């Protein structure tokens, strides 16, 4: 059934100019990562080589090589968010979940994003497609509460 | 001579207006786009470079070619900085020194100090640019590295272990600087994107998307290797053996492209072979076979001493030269007195030089007293030499391989250049990726069609045999419409004939709408392709064995030339009608006789004016009648009146059709000499044996497909003591001729004296110029890169009415499927040279590319054993299901003898040159277990015959 | 797809093309040969947001606002530890003194400000002493710094300049096409050098300086050419934190 | 033009009657006393050499110019083996390869891997004869060395620090192979015996009888330098 979805995706991006990125985006959105089982057909459709595809996949960060937990937590580690106390937040959260930075699981996945546009609302995060700001050491409780 | 040859400049050569500049206070004049680095190279002032190579386009990765330029800010790169007029550049200041030292510091901070026990010592472009810039200290107490197996706290995750999956080179990333020349080469030069850069930054590692190189799309060709400076990618023969000292230029014994090499030598031990950056044929590129497969010359199975039997059932007897030749000549004279001189014959080898070829045809004409010689070209590209002769005036190519660079379209009939002629396909893909267009007329999806970054492509997947119908329909389209060039016709061709041709072709029976039934190709597609070919400014045709090896080959070639003349794609760089010659020195061979109807120079044998010249030159009476051809030989010997044969460098058994028949004809022969290296399938029916010499031991020339005469040099020493021309003269003098040659230069001199075209040929010329196109007389002294450039040879082209004759090998109930025989990249024709190498990896067993739907009803699965129940025989083979081929078509390979493939193949042949029908054979593929009745007996014979005493 | 370097024009249009965001050298400009070998006009949003207003309201009006060289209004984004963050669009010539102490009050924590980082992480750490420094490309480029997208964060006395200077290289390390050597290696080496400095070694600071210099002069893009500014700035402005 | 000019043959030129021989299957005609090495050089067939130079007389120290000769026992040296008529010599067999690898192994077991940041990179006659012979592995877990500043349990007594007293060249014995070309040159060529070999065996170190070169009888003239292959004297 995966092949069907993939074919659909490829058909949807037919004739476009430089359609590798969109196609990969969609492939990821579908499954959750770029399986090596799907490096070839992409190439076959686009006239590329498995290698080029894998290289593109490897370069960019937003293309998962392996799936994530049921929940995902991106936590800015940039300048501004650092300024208004991101370290402490990070510590509290990774103590709560027991998962350090970059370390994933079947349950959750904590990672970094390096900005979100919430540079005034300095301590910022993205939890499961929901943005959060002004993350003091209290809101983390609510963050974890809705998130086991 | 040029500098490009010996020196690795930085960037490629550019064309443009002259531009003056001052590199480090030295005046230079060079084309516009040309870089600072290349100019500085041309001026002698060397600049530090690691990531810049001529093979490819430059990229500012190393940052070590930094220079101070007046009018610029900072320290820009020379690799990327194109010259401009009045530009004044400084190459070595204190600043630049400091920066370069810093960069190398950074490099080496992540490099192991395994120099002095690394393979590429003396040949690493990192080491010598680290000593150049003046590195003396590294200050970074590094913790994060790639080479270190053991970090602190445990193993290094960054450490990637070696990869020796490939039997010819090895990948040790521990020593990788990320210059990316490897990638750039596999993608720009070769054209198969097998390599990429996995990662972002320090974590960036070269990699093929696979566990190992072998599993990948990487075939071989060591471009990746030829370009790696830092022993990361390295040849194993350099790991085992030491790094070489000297270099010697030679050519490959394969493929007819003439890929020139320079053999690197450490004493007398051949360490490796690396392309030369010379020859218009290869500009520093190769394939696997030439680059790596040269180990047949050192195999235990090679034979080094003459042997005589006196009866095929009896075993051999290792014997010296003298008594062997005595026996030989005795039997020969006996037979010559008994059955006549016409009862003898030879078979020249294209694999051999042209000198030896000349000697052999002399031996056959001057000595034996006949015209019964031949060669491999009866079966590869004979019809060509008839059609192009009847139309243009030459039985040879039309253009070089540098022409393709200028074409705007490629029409490929019957060829698979990725396997046949790799280095040409590279240059083709280079042009395809640069916009050019492609039409392919094969029935079998070739990998040229699935090239990366391909432009537009049309594919006429037809039914084999119907190759003239399609051309006729193309012409019908062009004439029905009005797209052809009238100026060209009026000028370079005739008009009286053009009218007739047009009126013939204009018939609606030869229209695409009707042939679609028998052909299998669609109509609209054909019309489109025709319009596209006829519309383009500069189009070029490259054809091979799909046209020739048929019951209508000459006809097809003629049709093709008609198209080429109609459209106007002739007599210009970028266009022509190029046949892709195969074996090395097929062209040379055919040029130096090696045909039973001609003398050296494609001059007929009945020409008294020529026979006189040669009688005078050789001092002997010659025959005016034309000799026999191989099939004729065999039929005769079956019937009688043919008793002798001197087989030079050819396997008449595995590499010829109707194996049963040829065997029965080779057995009924009181004497059949052999002059190969190894014990071939032919020697199973032999009485005598003479060792030959490899291209490494020889000295002479090779005349390739683009008529280029590449020179072959001696690097090793003949293990058997004597090369092949030496042996030939041995035999001839032993018979009673009385030749005295001490060096083949004398022979080439003789040739230049006798035949025209080669009159200006001299070894010194080849040494200086580098290479020559054989039409080199006082006129066109430099050579003739392009034929028919000013009017055709006969004077006026000729239009000929072609028609499609239904082949006799049509299919029926018991032979429903068709068949096709072809090739592979790794292995050569019979693999006597190649099965004795490590190329049995990519291909160790011949397989049958069958179609699924044509298999389901049969019960075939990938890896299953099947039988080819044909008319002319039967064979067992392993299957392979693939949608490559069309339904009702099957594809086999004849490289392996364990499988007897040409036994299936039928006796049917061309009308003119009698080239066989290899590419068509009605067969029945079915499932089976017991191998066969023929293969068993064959193995029995071969085992009971290859035993020595 | 999550790659800072794709902000560079070449890498950007390489990423559009379906390839991997490796920066190209600049013999040809994208204007001549960019997207798919074609001429392409690449621009920032703010530069295209002013176009309609310009052509409509008249160029001469747009030419009124600004300094002699820098003309037109600019937005100043103000984030991090700061009471009144957000956005402030105005004509150039205003000092960060005003923008940070007067306009945007002080700090969220109420503490003073020790640092103000104009530009992104490719930008220097101007202290309070530089409050006499109006905003413009020229004066800021000349006064050992940068103003690009007019970024502006803030840090109070509870900040450690060492940590930040380290984060800079760590960034240049995690964000790096990996094409040229001075950002591949230079960065991940500087991040060790700074640790060594944190230890107390004295064979590091000059090493660091040389590294910074070669990164400036050699690197291909800015990300490995501007990276040194944060470092050198934190070091020369805030020596009391770098032992 | 002559080969002596561009190429460093092995041994000096000798005068005498012509003598024919077959170096690796190649005919050569040269004076009598002339060695195998020089002849092989004249014939183009190169043999691995470290301690042999034309400036001076040959000495069998490296043992890397070993060859198999018909009519002799073992693997004699070419540096010391004068030609004779009808002599047939083999230059590269498996045996010789093995032995040469072993010898270089021993050498490099006492050498620092500072190539790639040594002065004489691209111009060291040790490096290029270590790549020639085909060295790929060193198996001796060495403990006694000359280059190592820090041994186990403390400083290395064998370690001799550099000597930059001279303003034109420097002596780093850490990288000394004891080929003794330096000595041989100051004593045969120049003629002022300023250099000697202090010690017996592994403890043998080149030295001028003084704390430093300058204090010595060494004036200058970089013969010692022109001959040192291994950047010790540089
Ligand atoms: N690695 C390697 N290199 C080689 C060789 C090798 O064996 N291995 N062989 C050498 C020699 S001696 C040769 S002849 C040369 C040239 O060898 P090529 O010219 O490459 O000939 P083939 O690869 O056999 O097939 C040519 C293509 O045409 C297809 N074809 C079959 N029937 C028809 C038909 O009716 N019409 C059309 N239009 N096409 C058809 C075949 O199936 C195949 O796809 O290469 C030389 N180079
Ligand atoms: N089914 C089928 N049959 C075919 C073909 C096909 O496509 N399909 N192709 C046809 C064509 S394209 C051709 S070219 C033929 C070629 O087929 P062959 O005639 O078999 O040519 P090669 O494979 O080179 O081997 C010829 C012999 O000469 C020996 N030899 C190599 N180098 C030297 C040398 O320097 N000196 C001497 N004295 N001997 C040497 C080799 O070892 C080998 O044993 O096959 C033809 N038969
Ligand atoms: N060694 C280093 O430290 C380096 C740092 N940098 C710096 O980065 C800053 C900005 O980065 P970029 O945008 O990459 O370069 P840039 O600022 O030089 O170019 C500005 C924009 O205008 C275009 N442009 C430039 N010259 C043009 C011309 N003659 N005609 C038409 N269009 C032209 C470019 O395509 C680009 O989009 C610059 O200040 C540059 O100095 C860039 C290269 C190396
Ligand atoms: C690392 C890096 C990141 C960049 N990011 C951006 C960006 O986010 N937006 C932008 O407009 N220019 C960015 N640039 C500058 C571009 O190179 C280019 O100058 C700009 O996109 C052109 O817009 P303008 O013509 O309005 O300046 C970046 C450059 C570099 C080196
Ligand atoms: S690749 Fe070159 S620099 Fe690296 S260890 Fe080998 S010889 Fe030395
Ligand atoms: S050997 Fe040739 S095909 Fe294989 S990776 Fe290298 S360049 Fe590519
Ligand atoms: S494998 Fe060789 S050519 Fe490729 S990046 Fe590494 S060092 Fe360069
Ligand atoms: S392409 Fe042909 S000529 Fe060139 S190396 Fe390969 S086999 Fe030999
Ligand atoms: S500095 Fe870093 S990001 Fe910029 S081009 Fe070089 S390697 Fe790429
Ligand atoms: S003397 Fe020669 S072998 Fe020894 S470290 Fe220096 S360059 Fe390397
Ligand atoms: S430089 Fe000094 S030690 Fe060397 S040879 Fe000359 S005098 Fe002797
Ligand atoms: S100093 Fe140089 S020449 Fe003298 S023994 Fe040592 S390595 Fe040989
Ligand atoms: S810095 Fe984290 S929000 Fe922009
Ligand atoms: S030297 Fe020109 S960029 Fe590598
Ligand atoms: S090589 Fe002749 S002894 Fe040193
Ligand atoms: Mo052929
Ligand atoms: S052929």
Author numbering:
A (entry chain G): 2 to 149
B (entry chain A): 7 to 955
C (entry chain B): 251 to 493
D (entry chain E): 7 to 240
Text of the article:
One of these oxidoreductases, the metal-containing formate dehydrogenase, catalyses the following redox reaction: 1 CO2+2e−+H+⇌HCOO−,E∘,=−420mV In standard state, the equilibrium of the reaction favours formate oxidation at the active site Mo or W atom, which is energetically coupled to the reduction of oxidised nicotinamide adenine dinucleotide (NAD+) in cytoplasmic FDHs e.g. from Rhodobacter capsulatus and Cupriavidus necator. The RcFDH complex forms a 360 kDa dimer of FdsABGD heterotetramers. Subunit FdsA binds the bis-MGD cofactor, which coordinates the Mo atom in the active site together with the conserved Cys386 residue. The direct electron transfer chain between bis-MGD and FMN of the heterotetramer measures 76 Å and consists of five Fe-S clusters: A1, A2, A3, A5 and B6.
